[PDB]
């Protein structure tokens, strides 16, 4: 029926997506095999008598991340043809994932996604998951979205990009991979949610009191953002808002479509003991500047749109009071031309605890997706790290000697400089 | 099927449940082999658990209380350095309360009877006798070893000494507290005890 397709290209997308697919499986009560003992139809296709399969295509040039899913305990959830593997790595090279080892695998994945899309009409959109810093996630993502834009022009699609932090970056050529990716992640995506790893690192220190969190603890808490985001088209709600009504609310102008994210509460088993988590308090923690998941301080920028997703035991006349206090507060600053600054949403049944996890049982939660001029400094930052290394052509020959032309770089940087000028323009 | 398929406790569980199944079928349209959800097991036999008085207590007593296995060794530096936290934690949690909320069952890796007695004399909570088979059954079931000195069937070490495992009625692992594990928050991992949801039932 109505259905949305998820793609995970690159390692970062896959590990995050790997954490998605216990959460979606637990919520609907399906098993590692795929059989229960019309709601879940938006993510699970019926496969005869009670077996279900997810609508997720895994695409990685590395076998070493996807074959480990085929041998894993969730061997039987996916269709065996649905996990697609290549031969050779992109190796942090945008030119590799887009020009050379691109073509050998893209039309296999497009043939897979076409046999997944054409079963039902009333397609909602795409949930692509990728890495900005990487080679696969930057290159192969662009190559994927080129084909999808050609045939399905007027169907929406939204991306989750793990944007590089200022300090924590784990690689050397990621400022190259950023400007090059973000050139084509303007005109091929409708919603680009930016996640940052050192932001979630800060949250893991002050809320969970985890001094040593791995990728999998980050990915569990990223998957809670995804699950709360989509639950309106999947679960019965009191006032629900779906993917097709996001793009109207949150995106004011064609190119300004990068949104931050925040979640509240983020409370372990020690603490739910002691707080009640009333609607006024959990919506205040949502707007708290250290709870943003980008490390992009909203003090030096003016908001333009916010989408609050209440999920759990929440009544509408408490939300209205809670939102009102935020409007009156003068340091969270709203832009002049947007009176309808808040678009809220309420769902009934609360987020599910992954048993033996880190997060605790909560009777309610808030997912907050904000659009603001704060992220001017993020693009200005990456513009700066690009300009030191490009100034005298470090690592240029890796990209040049492989398929692109020196002049690709300067053309992309005019694009990112043009993006910077757009945020300053819309801010005033 | 929790946590592992190939454990002595699970295989004996499976054997008993399918004895029951076949015999019920033979006595009188019934699901073979039985589902894991429908399988049942009494975990501690009638006289495996003893308190500080060395008086045996039956299994039925532990209900309503969050029970944690404590895998420990007397001679181990880390067990010696962890014992005071756990003692203090025991005190401050089940003293000041409406009800007793926590309980610890101690299972031992000491070298012999005498070492086990000397280490069990510090225990105010419950303990399984060293020469009981049930000790080794729980070793293999929860997949703990100091280093690879017992045959595991393709798995690895879940963890090592010391460990605490909050358990459930059916021998399931409720949560792992990360002392000597990936997370490495030992002597602060005890704070992460969720005693709402892990009621013995």
């Amino acid at each position: 029926m109505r259905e949305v397709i998820s793609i995970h290209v690159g390692q970062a997308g896959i590990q995050i997506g790997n954490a998605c697919w216990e959460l979606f499986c637990l919520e609907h009560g399906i098993q590692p095999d795929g059989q229960m003992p019309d709601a879940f139809n938006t993510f699970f296709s019926e496969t005869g008598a009670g077996k279900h399969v997810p609508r997720c295509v895994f695409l990685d040039l590395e076998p070493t991340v996807v074959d480990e899913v085929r041998t894993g305990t969730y061997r039987h959830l996916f269709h065996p043809e649905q996990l697609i593997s290549g031969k050779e790595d992109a190796a942090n090279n945008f030119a590799r994932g887009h020009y050379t080892i691109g073509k050998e695998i893209v039309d296999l994945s497009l043939d897979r996604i076409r046999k997944l899309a054409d079963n039902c009409t009333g397609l909602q959109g795409f949930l692509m998951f990728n890495a900005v810093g990487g080679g696969t996630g930057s290159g192969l993502g662009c190559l994927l979205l080129e084909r999808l834009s050609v045939d399905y022009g007027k169907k929406s699609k939204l991306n989750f990009c793990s944007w590089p932090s200022p300090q924590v970056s784990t690689a050397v050529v990621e400022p190259y991979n950023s400007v090059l990716s973000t050139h084509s992640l303007l005109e091929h995506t409708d919603v680009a949610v930016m996640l940052d790893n050192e932001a979630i690192y800060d949250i893991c220190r002050r809320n969970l009191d985890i001094e040593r969190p791995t990728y999998t603890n980050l990915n569990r808490l990223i998957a809670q953002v995804i699950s709360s985001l989509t639950a309106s088209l999947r679960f019965d709600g009191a006032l629900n808002v779906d993917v097709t009504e996001f793009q109207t609310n949150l995106v004011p102008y064609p190119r300004i479509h990068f949104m931050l994210s925040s979640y509240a509460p983020i409370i372990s088993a020690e603490k739910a003991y002691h707080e009640q988590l009333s609607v006024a308090e959990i919506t205040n923690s949502a707007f708290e500047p250290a709870s943003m998941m980008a490390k992009c301080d909203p003090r030096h920028g003016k908001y333009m749109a916010c989408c609050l997703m209440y999920r759990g035991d929440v009544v509408p006349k408490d939300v209205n009071a809670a939102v009102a206090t935020i409007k009156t507060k003068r340091t969270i600053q709203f832009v002049d031309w947007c009176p309808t600054g808040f678009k809220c949403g309420i769902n009934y049944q609360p987020p599910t605890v992954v048993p033996g996890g880190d997060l605790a049982k909560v009777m309610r939660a808030v997912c907050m997706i904000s659009n603001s001029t704060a992220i001017a400094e993020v693009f200005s930052r990456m513009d700066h790290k690009f300009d030191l290394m490009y100034a005298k052509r470090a690592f240029v020959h890796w990209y040049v000697g492989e398929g692109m032309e020196e002049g690709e770089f300067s053309e992309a940087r005019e694009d990112l400089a043009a993006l910077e000028k757009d945020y300053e323009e819309v801010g005033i | 099927s929790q946590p592992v398929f190939a454990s002595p406790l699970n295989v004996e569980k499976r054997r008993l449940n399918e004895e029951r199944a076949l015999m019920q079928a033979q006595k009188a349209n019934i699901q073979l082999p039985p589902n894991y959800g429908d399988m049942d097991l009494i975990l501690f036999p009638e006289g495996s658990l003893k308190n500080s008085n060395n008086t045996v207590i039956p299994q039925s007593h532990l209900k309503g209380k969050s029970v944690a296995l404590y895998f420990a060794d007397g001679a181990d530096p880390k067990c010696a350095s962890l014992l005071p936290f756990l003692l203090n934690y025991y005190r401050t949690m089940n003293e000041g309360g409406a009800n007793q909320k926590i309980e610890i069952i101690f299972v031992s890796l000491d070298r012999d009877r005498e070492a086990f007695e000397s280490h069990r004399a510090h225990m105010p909570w419950l303990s399984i006798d060293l020469e009981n088979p049930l000790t080794e059954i729980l070793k293999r079931h929860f997949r703990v070893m100091k280093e690879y000195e017992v045959p595991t069937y393709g798995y690895g070490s879940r963890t090592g000494v010391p460990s605490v495992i909050v358990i459930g009625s059916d021998g399931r692992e409720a949560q792992f507290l990360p002392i000597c594990s990936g997370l490495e928050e030992g002597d602060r991992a005890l704070l992460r005890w969720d005693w709402r949801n892990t009621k013995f039932a």
């Binding site: 637990l26 098993q31 894993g72 305990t73 033996g356 | 690895g156 990936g182």
Partner: peptide, 22 residues
């Protein structure tokens, strides 16, 4: 001279079959 192997993968130690919600 072969000592055994006592280290766990990230996948195997953690993405274990979770108990199911009602």
């Amino acid at each position: 001279p072969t000592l055994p192997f006592n280290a766990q993968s990230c996948y195997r130690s953690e993405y274990v079959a979770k108990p199911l919600p009602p």
